[PDB]
Design a protein around this ligand. Structure first.
Ligand SMILES: CCCCCCCCCCCCCCCCCC(=O)OC[C@H](CO[C@@H]1O[C@H](CO[C@H]2O[C@H](CO)[C@H](O)[C@H](O)[C@H]2O)[C@H](O)[C@H](O)[C@H]1O)OC(=O)CCCCCCCCCCCCCCCCC
Ligand SMILES: CCCCCCCCCCCCCCCCCC(=O)OC[C@H](CO[C@@H]1O[C@H](CO[C@H]2O[C@H](CO)[C@H](O)[C@H](O)[C@H]2O)[C@H](O)[C@H](O)[C@H]1O)OC(=O)CCCCCCCCCCCCCCCCC
Ligand SMILES: CCCCCCCCCCCCCCCCCC(=O)OC[C@H](CO[C@@H]1O[C@H](CO[C@H]2O[C@H](CO)[C@H](O)[C@H](O)[C@H]2O)[C@H](O)[C@H](O)[C@H]1O)OC(=O)CCCCCCCCCCCCCCCCC
Ligand code: CLA
Ligand code: CLA
Ligand code: CLA
Ligand code: CLA
Ligand SMILES: CCCCCCCCCCCCCCCCCC(=O)OC[C@H](CO[C@@H]1O[C@H](CO)[C@H](O)[C@H](O)[C@H]1O)OC(=O)CCCCCCCCCCCCCCCCC
Ligand SMILES: CCCCCCCCCCCCCCCCCC(=O)OC[C@H](CO[C@@H]1O[C@H](CO)[C@H](O)[C@H](O)[C@H]1O)OC(=O)CCCCCCCCCCCCCCCCC
Ligand SMILES: CCCCCCCCCCCCCCCC(=O)OC[C@H](CO[C@@H]1O[C@H](CS(=O)(=O)O)[C@@H](O)[C@H](O)[C@H]1O)OC(=O)CCCCCCCCCCCCCCC
Ligand code: OEX
Ligand SMILES: [Cl-]
Lengths: 58, 45, 57, 231, 38, 131, 102, 334, 36, 32, 35, 93, 36
């Protein structure tokens, strides 16, 4: 139960539409992207600083 | 701003309502015995 | 638009809404309590009170 | 609520009162003066304050209700007044010259707009500042927000040749610099100092959602104050 | 007072009535489904 | 490693482990609140990464340059001094924590600053990304 | 930024608000950013630089005493953020700063 | 014969009311009803709230594109802070809705109502002639609700940092709290987790021991619950049998011989656990965070060897750099 | 094509009176069985 | 239109709570 | 907004007054072990 | 925006574009920070390099510092999304 | 947006077990009433 499809559709169609669920989705993206490099070292994830999601980045 | 009161009309209920409740409570208390007791609480009502 | 009870609300006075619009097309800055929403909520509260009265009786 | 009334009060009795963003105007006991300009001394305009009233947005022009609290006035705007093309033009370079405020149309919708006079090149009538002179010009309104994926739908970016192109304009956050026009008139001018007071009429555009919604035009009619002194 | 209401009566529905009601409701659904859908 | 450059010509000095430990302790006590992890919490445009120290006028990629910066701190261009804003032995009255640091203390602090780029690379001055 | 060439009063933030100086909900000139919630602060190193409309820009650019600079430079680093094992900074900091505020 | 006030006090403190009112209920009922009314109507139909104060409202009501899970009453604006924001302190009602005033109204009324609920539990314990420490047990969830609704906003200086009145908002509160304070490594939160896990363990254990040793009082064609009659004098289950089973299960004094001591332990373990985790949140409101074991292992040279705390720190950094977008204009989060 | 929410109409209008009749019949049968 | 379903489910839950509180089976002691 | 404020002040004062003068009305006597 | 071709010169490469880059990219070139770059950012829009060398109030020593870094320096068309963030740009590490 | 035929799922899964419980309760109450 990762996502609600209608909420994601409404957030994609309307950039001003935001709920706490979308903020949770962004936090999950942050966890994954900032955690996978050292949490799964066998994959050899090399994420540059520009692909890492940041709140100030957008 | 004392008690968050910025208009003097706000003081009328804040003072007035406790006065009426105290009038009712004072009737109740005047119905009582009102002499000293030697116990943890007063069993007379 | 298929409004059924809105015509009967607008027939005898209730024409404004808390959203700031009127059914005549004008804009209302101060709607007051007796808007469409006010009438609907009054009917809901009246329904609840009558339900409690029915329970008591 | 003049400048003497501003300077007389301390911050303890102005906090939480709303008297700070008032655009202090000159009094009639100090009005009825004039300001002249020499051909050798450089001049600049300081403490240019604007307090907008009666926010109107065309969507006809319908009056709106303010959603923010006391964050809509501009204060302390400074810039040099420079002779150019016969007259002399005011170049805006500093001060609090933007205000991100939201107003509500009487239908439930909110239209945020950025009240600004940034990059103004306004020139005012005649070669003196007195009761009757008007200052007008055009300013450049920056976007409400500043600076490639629909991460919600990984299967939308698989359609083949046409991927996420329906949701492209919302994805393409474009910085758009709209333009606006400001017209202010000076009702009263102080002669002892370089202070002038009056009203202003502004017309600019609202938020574009970085190029995702149509910018509604906003009409702002408030009061204005400013000081002219040495540069 | 709050207790035995003298007007309390039991309610019955024999199997014939049950089958008639089921037939009525199902036949009405069969009849009106084509019109509700279109 | 324990070998850091000393002079600007290319001379290197081998640090004793006691010097390394004392420099680490003094750097965590006197510089940590603003130079945790080799970054600057108060001016993030500059940091203690070796590329920022080497690409400076004068270059701070040696012991003597770091000691001179701790004695007379200048801007990144070098023309303007920041002794009022930056801790220094010149401004020990301004910053009271500098009054206990001697020349050997500055030597140890500079050795610790130079030693860290060779220690857990990409983490010194890389910020919170390399944690 | 006022000393090293950056117009703070006209610098638009990421959301159109003030990045350095913004407007308070009561209409005063306050410090911008996420510190707008702490605009009720009264400190002896900032009250001389504070007019009836909030922070006076002219007094900011003219009437700074150096001891106020020292106080503000000292207070900005030892923020009241710490841990039970006495590690300074936010919870995502390394074990090199030893400070929890009294 | 009695005065009108005496009759009013007899009706208020009456044990014949279907729901006991009491003097604490005089404060409790209107506050809780006000909070419930505002919460219901603001959860169904309330305009989006600029929680961060950056003029980017967040939708939380059902009519603005939310379901039960994503719906919430958004906390108040960061521009407000912990300033008192009733309806009359706003220029208009819609300005009050834009800045999240309903959150403050609901939170204040709910906290007053739950304090009244504590007092009312005491009051009806007193009117019935029983011992009055159920309210002490109820103080723990009240402490936790206060910590997440009032104390954390007080510590952080803004009511926007309180827990949103929703589900996804609650999850967002948990994630941001973990990012900024590392609550998992805080020993008081660990005591709270031990409290809830032990409470579940002991609830299941006591229920299974009582249900296992029920005295045979029913036939095979009926529920075993009817072997107990409401108000009977004898005990419905064999306490000695359950004690013997549990003594032979672990060891002969791992059980409680005394039922009163056993029930004191049952009421003690999770109440103390929730007290400790609520106090941990109260202390992290003032930024006394949990254990920090980042970069605690280095090699002979001094290179950082990561631990599980370092991977946890990476996750906390991932949550930290993404929370409250465009509300941070400065490097540190002080 | 075919209007939606008519599935709800058809199925609920089929179920609810059927539910009512089934409940009535079961109630009556159990009352008869308890009368014995 | 799903908002109507959510409101209906929440109101039904509250009605169940109301009836469970006020129309509960009255507890009485048996004559065992 | 002032009318709502005075209504709320009146209501809060009314209920707090009832609370205060109810707990002053010999509340300790209202127990089943009295007399 | 999604598509912007003129962004290897915002600090991603050797050649640095003025009036579209932050002051942090001048820390790579020695002697170009915090001085000189302030003059570049204050009077931002330039047609080419010589406009920066002429309209900027550069002292002779600053002019020599400019003369040290001709090839890794350019001036392209200004983008208002990067003009507004040439002092802070939100980068802090 | 919101997927259709989930109204049917929600409403039928709410109604049918509720129907079952109501029928059970009414049947039990009528059996108790005829036991008297
Ligand atoms: C509903 C009615 C309930 C009243 C509760 C209000 C919440 C208390 C509060 O927000 O408390 C904070 C205030 C402190 O107020 C702060 O006071 C500050 C005073 O500082 C000012 O003055 C200072 C003077 O040096 C400095 O100069 C400072 O810079 C300057 O701003 C500012 O005004 C802040 O804006 C203001 O928030 O405390 C107070 O008034 C006194 C402390 C009240 C008790 C603390 C409440 C504890 C929480 C309840 C406990 C729950 C526990 C669980 C129980 C189960
Ligand atoms: C069920 C859950 C029950 C709770 C379990 C917690 C009790 C476990 C023992 C405490 C943790 C432990 O292993 O204790 C270890 C820590 C010691 O921490 C050390 O703290 C050091 C602090 O260093 C700092 O100071 C150093 C000074 O040389 C350096 O400068 C270093 O750079 C700087 O970061 C390290 O950094 C590491 O944190 C670690 O080595 O004990 C401490 O912090 C001492 C103070 C914490 C006491 C525990 C809090 C009380 C909680 C009681 C709750 C009732 C139970
Ligand atoms: C239940 C068991 C609790 C006992 C914990 C084990 C005892 C020994 C471990 C311990 O404690 O740890 C050992 C420490 C001594 O260790 C030294 O502790 C120092 C504490 O730092 C202090 O000093 C530093 C500079 O000296 C900084 O200033 C820092 O900010 C400041 O906190 C540093 O961590 C040193 O590196 C370290 O060597 O004992 C201490 O400090 C002694 C503290 C005991 C008194 C604590 C009284 C309670 C304080 C109020 C708590 C509020 C509670 C709210 C809920 C939470
Ligand atoms: C005398 C009975 C009556 C009449 C004449 C109408 C008349 C109408 N209804 Mg209506 N309606 C009624 C009872 C009635 N309704 C009742 C009792 C309900 C509750 C089950 C509804 C629920 C209802 C809905 C849900 C809708 C209508 C709609 C409509 C319009 C088509 C029309 C104005 C439709 C419309 O256009 O309204 C917007 C529509 O969508 N009605
Ligand atoms: C305080 C009482 C009150 C008030 C002020 C209202 C007000 C309103 N109701 Mg309402 N309502 C109420 C109670 C009330 N209701 C109650 C208790 C019920 C439950 C039965 C309802 C059920 C209800 C419905 C179902 C509807 C309204 C509607 C309305 C609106 C339009 C009214 C209209 O057109 O009526 C017109 C009324 C009539 C034409 C009735 C006339 C009376 C008959 C003709 C009398 C004839 C017999 C009489 C005994 C003759 C002998 C006496 C004679 C000799 C004088 C209006 C806002 C409508 C609306 O817009 O919905 C929101 C709507 O559809 N109401
Ligand atoms: C038990 C009754 C009760 C109590 C205690 C409260 C309490 C409160 N209400 Mg409330 N309210 C109630 C019933 C109650 N309400 C009812 C029945 C309604 C429906 C009409 C409302 C409608 C309502 C609204 C619409 C609002 C409130 C608000 C408030 C808060 C502002 C307090 C205030 O105005 O002080 C006035 C009273 C005094 C100053 C007297 C104080 C006397 C004490 C003894 C002094 C010491 C107090 C100290 C903290 C201890 C406060 C938490 C406001 C709010 O939530 O703001 C965020 C708000 O906007 N209420
Ligand atoms: C398996 C893992 C696990 C477990 C068991 C827990 C367990 C707990 N966590 Mg936790 N957490 C975890 C993982 C875990 N966490 C992770 C991974 C994170 C990081 C994302 C967090 C982050 C986190 C935070 C940030 C917080 C917790 C808190 C808590 C505690 C909750 C206190 C509570 O709700 O009861 C207490 C009871 C209440 C709060 C309810 C109040 C009840 C009021 C008084 C009445 C309500 C009545 C209601 C309105 C009406 C009812 C209906 C009506 C009809 C009757 C609990 C001990 C919280 C805590 O410590 O407590 C402060 C807290 O703030 N956790
Ligand atoms: C003593 C406690 C036991 C009392 C028994 C009575 C129980 C009363 C229940 C409390 C309900 C009263 C709620 C009113 C509180 C409120 O927010 O008032 C809100 C008002 C402020 O009111 C606001 O004020 C603003 C000021 O600019 C504006 O005027 C606003 O318009 C106005 O609403 O606050 C007070 O009246 C405070 C009075 C002094 C109380 C300080 C003690 C509180 C700190 C200790 C308590 C925590 C421990
Ligand atoms: C949403 C509401 C949908 C409409 C349903 C209306 C409720 C039905 C009326 C109440 C019937 C009731 O109480 O049961 C009353 C009868 C039970 O029968 C009652 O039994 C009692 C025993 O204590 C007494 O004998 C009473 O006299 C006798 O009426 O139940 C029925 O069989 C009616 C079933 C109604 C079906 C409900 C599902 C509808 C969908
Ligand atoms: C470092 C040391 C200093 C600080 C530590 C201080 C120690 C604290 C405990 C000592 C004070 C309390 C004494 C025991 C409590 C009591 O009421 O005695 C009465 C009985 C004790 O035995 C009962 O005692 C009865 C006899 S008598 O009346 O108590 O005399 C007897 O009849 C009965 O059979 C028997 O079961 O109560 C109990 O059965 C509970 C025993 C366990 C309670 C205290 C231990 C702590 C448990 C964990 C705490 C919760 C943490 C949860 C977090 C997730
Ligand atoms: O919002 Mn909730 O947490 Ca009080 O600090 Mn700053 O802000 Mn945000 O970060 Mn950290
Ligand atoms: Cl910030």
């Amino acid at each position: 139960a990762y996502d609600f499809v209608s909420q994601e559709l409404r957030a994609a169609e309307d950039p001003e539409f935001e709920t706490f669920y979308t903020k949770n989705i962004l936090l999950n993206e942050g966890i994954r992207s900032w955690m996978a490099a050292q949490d799964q070292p066998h994959e050899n994830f090399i994420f540059p600083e520009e692909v890492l999601p940041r709140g100030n980045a957008l | 701003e004392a008690l968050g009161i910025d208009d003097t009309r706000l003081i009328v209920p804040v003072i007035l309502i406790p006065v009426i409740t105290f009038i009712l409570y004072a009737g109740f208390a005047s119905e009582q015995d009102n002499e000293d007791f030697f116990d943890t609480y007063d069993q007379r009502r | 638009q298929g409004m059924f009870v809105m015509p009967f609300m607008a027939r005898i006075g209730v024409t404004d809404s808390w959203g700031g619009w009127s059914v005549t097309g004008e804009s209302v800055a101060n709607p007051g309590f007796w808007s469409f929403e006010g009438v609907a909520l009054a009917h809901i509260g009246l329904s609840g009170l009558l339900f409690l009265a029915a329970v008591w009786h | 609520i003049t400048t003497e009334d501003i300077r007389g009060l301390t911050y303890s009795q102005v906090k939480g009162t709303g008297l700070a963003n008032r655009c202090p105007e000159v009094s009639e006991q100090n009005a009825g003066g004039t300001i002249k300009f020499a051909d050798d001394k450089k001049y600049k305009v300081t403490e240019l304050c604007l307090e907008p009233k009666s926010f109107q947005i065309e969507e006809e022009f319908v009056d709106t209700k303010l959603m923010t609290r006391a964050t809509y006035s501009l204060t302390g705007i400074e810039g040099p007044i420079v002779f150019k093309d016969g007259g002399l033009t005011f170049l805006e370079k500093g001060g609090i010259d933007y205000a991100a405020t939201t107003v509500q149309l009487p239908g439930g919708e909110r239209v945020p707009f950025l009240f600004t006079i940034k990059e103004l090149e306004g020139k005012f009538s005649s070669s003196q500042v007195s009761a009757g002179t008007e200052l007008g010009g055009n300013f450049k309104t920056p976007s409400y927000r500043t600076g490639d994926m629909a991460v919600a739908l990984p299967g939308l970016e698989a359609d083949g040749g046409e991927g996420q192109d329906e949701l492209f304009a919302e994805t393409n956050k474009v910085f758009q610099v709209t333009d606006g026009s400001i017209e202010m008139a000076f009702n009263r001018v102080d002669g002892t100092n370089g202070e002038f007071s009056g009203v202003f009429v502004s017309e600019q555009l609202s938020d574009t959602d970085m190029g995702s919604k149509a910018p509604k035009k906003v009409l702002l009619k408030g009061i204005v104050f400013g000081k002219i002194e040495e540069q | 007072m709050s207790g035995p209401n003298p007007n309390k009566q039991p309610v019955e529905l024999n199997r014939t009535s049950l089958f008639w009601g089921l037939l009525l409701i199902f036949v009405l659904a069969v009849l009106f489904s084509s019109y509700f859908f279109n | 490693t324990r070998t850091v450059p000393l002079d600007s010509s290319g001379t290197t000095v081998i640090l004793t482990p006691e010097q390394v430990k004392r420099g680490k302790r003094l750097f965590n006590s006197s510089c940590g609140n603003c130079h945790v992890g080799g970054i600057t919490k108060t001016n993030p445009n500059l940091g203690l990464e070796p590329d920022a120290l080497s690409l400076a006028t004068p270059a701070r990629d040696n012991i003597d340059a770091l000691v001179d910066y701790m004695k007379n701190p200048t801007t990144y261009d070098g023309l303007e001094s920041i002794a009022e804003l930056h801790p220094s032995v010149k401004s020990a009255d301004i910053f009271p924590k500098m009054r206990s640091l001697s020349d050997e203390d500055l030597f140890a602090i500079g050795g610790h600053i130079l030693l860290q780029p060779k220690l857990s690379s990409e983490k010194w001055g890389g910020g919170k990304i390399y944690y | 930024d006022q000393r090293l060439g950056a117009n703070v009063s006209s610098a638009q933030g990421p959301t159109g608000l003030g990045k350095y100086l913004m407007r308070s909900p009561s209409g005063e000139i306050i410090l911008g950013g996420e510190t707008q919630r702490f605009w009720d602060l009264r400190a002896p190193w900032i009250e001389p630089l504070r007019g009836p409309n909030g922070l006076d820009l002219n007094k900011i650019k003219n009437d700074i005493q150096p001891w106020q600079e020292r106080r503000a430079a000292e207070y900005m680093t030892h923020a009241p953020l710490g841990s039970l094992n006495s590690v300074g900074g936010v919870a995502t900091e390394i074990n090199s700063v030893n400070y929890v505020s009294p | 014969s009695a005065s009108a006030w005496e009759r009013f006090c007899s009706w208020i403190t009456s044990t014949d009311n279907r729901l006991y009112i009491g003097w604490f209920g005089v404060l409790m009922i209107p506050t809780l009803l006000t909070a419930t009314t505002v919460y219901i109507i603001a959860f169904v139909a309330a305009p989006p709230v600029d929680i961060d104060g950056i003029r980017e409202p967040v939708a939380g009501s059902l009519l603005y594109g939310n379901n039960i899970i994503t719906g919430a009453v958004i906390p108040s604006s960061a521009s407000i802070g912990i300033h008192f924001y009733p309806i009359w302190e706003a220029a208009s009602l819609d300005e009050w809705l834009y800045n999240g005033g309903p959150y403050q109204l609901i939170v204040d009324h709910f906290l007053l109502g739950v304090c009244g609920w504590i007092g009312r539990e005491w009051e009806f314990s007193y009117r019935l002639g029983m011992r009055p420490w159920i309210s002490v047990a109820f103080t723990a969830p009240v402490a936790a609700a206060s910590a997440v609704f009032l104390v954390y906003p007080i510590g952080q200086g803004s009511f926007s940092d309180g827990m949103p009145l929703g589900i996804s908002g609650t999850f967002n509160f948990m994630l941001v709290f973990q990012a900024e304070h590392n609550i998992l490594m805080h020993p008081f939160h660990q005591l709270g987790v031990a409290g809830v896990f032990g409470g579940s363990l002991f609830s299941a254990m006591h229920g299974s021991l009582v249900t296992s040793s029920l005295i045979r009082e029913t036939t095979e064609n009926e529920s075993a619950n009817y072997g107990y009659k409401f108000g009977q004098e004898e005990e419905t289950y064999n306490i000695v049998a359950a004690h013997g089973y549990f003594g032979r299960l672990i060891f002969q004094y791992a059980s409680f011989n005394n039922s009163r001591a056993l029930h004191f332990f049952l009421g003690l373990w999770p109440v103390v656990g929730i007290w400790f985790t609520a106090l941990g949140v109260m202390t992290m409101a003032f930024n006394l965070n949990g254990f920090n074991f980042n970069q605690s292992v280095v090699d002979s040279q001094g290179r950082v060897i990561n631990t599980w705390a370092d991977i946890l720190n990476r996750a906390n950094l991932g949550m930290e750099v993404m929370h409250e977008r465009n509300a941070h204009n400065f490097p540190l989060d002080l | 094509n075919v209007s939606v929410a008519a599935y709800l109409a058809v199925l609920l209008g089929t179920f609810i009176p059927v539910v009512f009749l089934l409940t009535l019949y079961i109630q009556s049968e159990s009352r008869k069985a308890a009368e014995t | 239109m799903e908002t109507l379903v959510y409101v209906f489910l929440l109101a039904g839950t509250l009605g169940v709570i109301f009836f469970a509180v006020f129309f509960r089976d009255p507890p009485r002691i048996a004559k065992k | 907004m002032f009318t709502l404020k005075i209504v709320v002040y009146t209501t809060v004062t009314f209920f707090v007054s009832l609370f205060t003068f109810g707990f002053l009305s010999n509340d300790a006597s209202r127990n089943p072990n009295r007399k | 925006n999604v598509e912007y071709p003129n962004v290897p010169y915002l600090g991603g490469s050797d050649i640095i574009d003025v009036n579209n880059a932050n002051v942090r990219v001048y820390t790579r070139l020695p002697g170009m920070y915090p001085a000189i770059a302030k003059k570049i950012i204050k009077r931002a829009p330039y047609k080419d390099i010589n406009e920066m060398l002429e309209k900027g109030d550069f002292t002779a020593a600053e002019k020599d510092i400019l003369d040290k870094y001709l090839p890794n320096l350019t001036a392209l068309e200004p983008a208002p999304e990067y003009v507004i963030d040439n002092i802070n740009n939100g980068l802090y590490r």
